[PDB]
């Protein structure tokens, strides 16, 4: 299904990124049939109407639009990137790299916190923000 809008080419991607001025643009790069992307898309669909106020979500198929792979280093199954007014925002998740997500989380509540923190940091002007939790460990006990 994936009723969320999909972007089919770099032109559409850039137009969508530049269209918004006061809402964070979320992009899920990956193949819709990969189970990791399936889980991520499920969560994003759940949170769409919750964070409609200050965020807009979009999905890109890597095969359909491969131009961004080299520049944005899209080689993992699924990645999530955040943009605001044509600026790429970084997040200190503690995983080692602050550019993308690159894995699938399962807690929509934490995803909501990430969106809120990224939006707040972008409005405050920071190009890099700090997530309110560290993912360096999988916190399994």
């Amino acid at each position: 299904s994936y009723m969320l809008p999909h972007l089919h080419n770099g032109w559409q991607v850039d137009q969508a990124i530049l269209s918004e001025e006061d809402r964070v643009v979320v992009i899920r790069f990956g193949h819709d049939w990969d189970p990791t992307c399936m889980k991520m898309d499920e969560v994003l669909y759940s949170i769409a109407e919750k964070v409609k106020n200050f965020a807009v979500i979009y999905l890109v198929d890597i095969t359909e639009v491969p131009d961004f792979n080299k520049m944005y280093e899209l080689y993992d199954p699924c990645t999530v990137m955040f943009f605001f007014r044509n600026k790429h925002i970084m997040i200190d998740l503690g995983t080692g790299n602050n550019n993308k997500i690159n894995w699938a989380m399962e807690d929509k509540q934490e995803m909501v916190d990430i969106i809120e923190t990224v939006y707040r940091g972008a409005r405050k002007g920071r190009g890099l923000v700090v997530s309110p939790k560290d993912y360096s460990t999988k916190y399994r006990y």
Partner: peptide, 11 residues
């Protein structure tokens, strides 16, 4: 036009 026309740059 490619994604470079956006004025963006890879990290």
């Amino acid at each position: 036009v490619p994604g470079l026309g956006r004025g963006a740059t890879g990290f």
